[PDB]
Design a protein around this ligand. Sequence first.
Ligand SMILES: N[C@@H](Cn1oc(=O)[nH]c1=O)C(=O)O
Ligand SMILES: N[C@@H](Cn1oc(=O)[nH]c1=O)C(=O)O
Ligand SMILES: N[C@@H](Cn1oc(=O)[nH]c1=O)C(=O)O
Ligand SMILES: N[C@@H](Cn1oc(=O)[nH]c1=O)C(=O)O
Ligand SMILES: [Cl-]
Ligand SMILES: [Cl-]
Ligand SMILES: [Cl-]
Ligand SMILES: [Cl-]
Lengths: 251, 251, 251, 251
Amino acid sequence: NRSLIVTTILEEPYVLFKKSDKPLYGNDRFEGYCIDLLRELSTILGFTYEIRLVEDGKYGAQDDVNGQWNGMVRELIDHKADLAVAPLAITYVREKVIDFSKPFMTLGISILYRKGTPIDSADDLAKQTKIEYGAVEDGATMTFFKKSKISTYDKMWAFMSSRRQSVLVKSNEEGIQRVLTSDYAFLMESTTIEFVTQRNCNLTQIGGLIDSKGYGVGTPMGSPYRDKITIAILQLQEEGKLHMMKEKWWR
Amino acid sequence: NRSLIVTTILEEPYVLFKKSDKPLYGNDRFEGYCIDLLRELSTILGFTYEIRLVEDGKYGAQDDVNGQWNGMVRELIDHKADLAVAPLAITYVREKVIDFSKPFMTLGISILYRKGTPIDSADDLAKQTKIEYGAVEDGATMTFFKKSKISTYDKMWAFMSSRRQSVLVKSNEEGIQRVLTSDYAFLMESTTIEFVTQRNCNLTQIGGLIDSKGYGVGTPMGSPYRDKITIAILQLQEEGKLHMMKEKWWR
Amino acid sequence: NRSLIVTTILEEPYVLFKKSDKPLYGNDRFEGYCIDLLRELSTILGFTYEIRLVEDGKYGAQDDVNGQWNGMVRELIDHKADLAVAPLAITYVREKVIDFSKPFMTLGISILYRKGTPIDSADDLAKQTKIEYGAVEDGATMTFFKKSKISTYDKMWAFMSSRRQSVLVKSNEEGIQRVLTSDYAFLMESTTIEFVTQRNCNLTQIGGLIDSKGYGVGTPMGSPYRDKITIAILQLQEEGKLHMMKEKWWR
Amino acid sequence: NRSLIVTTILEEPYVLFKKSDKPLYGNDRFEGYCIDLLRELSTILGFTYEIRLVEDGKYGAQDDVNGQWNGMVRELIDHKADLAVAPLAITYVREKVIDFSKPFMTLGISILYRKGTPIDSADDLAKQTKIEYGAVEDGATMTFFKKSKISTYDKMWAFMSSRRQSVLVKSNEEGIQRVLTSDYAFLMESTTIEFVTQRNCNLTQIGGLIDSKGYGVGTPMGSPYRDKITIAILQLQEEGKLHMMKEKWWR
Ligand SMILES: N[C@@H](Cn1oc(=O)[nH]c1=O)C(=O)O
Ligand SMILES: N[C@@H](Cn1oc(=O)[nH]c1=O)C(=O)O
Ligand SMILES: N[C@@H](Cn1oc(=O)[nH]c1=O)C(=O)O
Ligand SMILES: N[C@@H](Cn1oc(=O)[nH]c1=O)C(=O)O
Ligand SMILES: [Cl-]
Ligand SMILES: [Cl-]
Ligand SMILES: [Cl-]
Ligand SMILES: [Cl-]
């Protein structure tokens, strides 16, 4: 039973490089909610593993031209990883190419912006073009807008799409820092927004949740690990361990 | 400028009887998030008021038979009150008969249940008939299920409707107590669930949000106060006062 | 401009007595698709009205002996009513004695029977004499069979005719209840069959439509209201209001 | 017992290419109402099969000049297939050259058009030449008009025939698209119209059914399979399976 290769992505407080005065090795080099989850999965299900950072640095989306997937989703498809343990949104389009365990966390797309402004909803952003807004490129949020038939969101996509290179960022961190330096609103997941606004009193969520989804462990389609992982996650859920992990990393 | 009549409903931590040794009079007899909001609205917009508890003790739903509304919605329709300041959900069906200010709080329907169980979503409740579940009668949540066309929710309503007297309670507090004394899951709004679980370690929210909505001040349709109230709420929102009020009452 | 007298007949979901905990008066005593249609006609064309239930309880047919008409058709002929707003089939024989507006609904004669049987068409009923079948007396369906030169239907009429008092019922409701209690097949209009099978999972339509016709508002021949009514109906049609009414009463 | 060759044609929701990330093989490459029917026929009657799409992409009509048939009808005549399982209309002219099982579905020709217009019947289309209209070439609907002796239909055919290249399309999907991009009305079967309008709120059926017919499995004339197939279809009908299949694909 060789070690499983687990792909993930850097995103506070789910996954981050662990800091230490002394050299760190193997699994100890990383820490976070998803890293704790991965550890619990490994002992409950009995497996060793190597943590690999998704090489192209993306979550996963289908290319508009050739329809090929990228990010963690593509690494699973190509069997370059056995599992993807990260804040990976369970979506319909992704379920068509990879499998997901049951959710270990629920969330929804929302807006991150500076406080003190009259912007109070997605509509308030969509009805104007002065304040720019975006999302991380090749992520579930972007895909949500790209596929939305809801007028407000569809026009928001038209906006983002027409200014793609300027408003779609390489990482959520890049979008957050931007909201802090320029007149920019950032579309990202509520769980993360909670973490960010907790540590930046100048930031706030705008409006409520635009949708409802969950984070799940991804596996190559047909993987025998998916159902086992679901059993482990549901067990961690019932015992209140997932709640304890959330409190630990969010506070 | 006679005092305005404000209808509301008892629901912690939005509205509650203020406790005291010395007799309390007038507006001071009540307290809560919505009572603070009402106070801020009165000084900002310049009006005095009388707080009245909705006579039939209901939020508001349209009767199947005669299609007549009840609760605070009906009190506004009949002009028995000038404003309704309470955790009143802004919904399409209500907007057809009364007006709402912009929301002062965003939330969504979710599930309240005991922790330690294998129930992890609305689907887990819907696919079984042992564990009963319900909502407050004549409220936005019940109406959501009654009108839902979504498979899971549609069958959950079939369930609730067929056991109406047993599972649709007269108040949210009744539903919460039912969750603590029997194998019962309660469908109610996330903002309130947050408050309840914060004070009852044995309770927990199940799954994420089933929908997205907001609480707004209700007024008779055509009321000149609605737009004024919206300006006051948006101002309280911008200055961070609504956030301060939420923190104060949810702690 | 005195109130118009409108004759109609009881038939779910077109016309029915409205139920209420409190006393109902005037037009409010009735409800249904045709009652909604009548209301829309009254406001669009500007007239008040009295709803009268056809006294002999019949739709309308010509007596085999003296050739006199009965039902709603006869009430129009005798000018006992200004309009007939009901699920009244527009037929050639009726057009000879009264006028019809353009159709507000299209349908066709079909078979209502229990499911799980080998009966799959009119032919399957006609080729046997064990299973009895009928239609409402003095209605368009009966008249269709009585005048049909199509072998299968002509022999079906011979059958019904020879057992008239046993198989021809007083109302469609009587024929439906019978299909539910005995080995009986009922010939009636597809629109109504749709409503019935929707509420009785034990019932089903057998085969397709035996013919094609429509329901129209009837008026005494030469009535100045007929063309106006047609304008109103065509307007309700174009705006999708007739479709909305159908969905409302059929679901 | 070699596998039977089954000819069919692409037409939602009867027959369509099944979508998937993983490669699909054999029978699994297709799906739809008729594909489910075909599967049930194979297990009930005991045969394996190969699905082939009719080479010339046509349903079947007899050529004016050489009086030769084309489409699935011709493939059956020439014994290029053992069965034709598709939304194949049972018609008198086809019964002269191939055999049909009893129908598995009943329908009728009707009109597909945009809503909000004053067109309310075939007569409204026939009495004008501005709005063009047509049908799929080499199909039962076109043949119905081509052979009709009914005034309205006869002139509608004169119209279509004189503009054949412009108004007679190569597929029903082409006709539907034409309805959404130009002042065009499309003559097609009611079962399919139901499916189309259910998914395109801008479309609607115009008038009622112009005729009555059914879909049956086609076989070469004299095929020993035809009676066996009829027994299987009638059994599926009785048990309610055909109704279940219709609900599944029409939703
Ligand atoms: N978890 C997201 C990545 N991304 O992070 C957000 O907060 N929004 C977003 O699109 C994904 O799995 O695609
Ligand atoms: N806020 C609700 C009342 N009720 O409280 C809940 O939490 N659900 C629910 O239906 C309303 O305005 O109708
Ligand atoms: N609508 C019919 C009465 N009746 O109802 C049916 O369904 N068939 C029938 O003859 C009429 O106007 O005569
Ligand atoms: N099912 C038809 C083909 N076609 O599809 C329609 O809807 N009309 C029409 O002619 C046939 O078997 O010829
Ligand atoms: Cl590692
Ligand atoms: Cl008071
Ligand atoms: Cl009346
Ligand atoms: Cl195949």
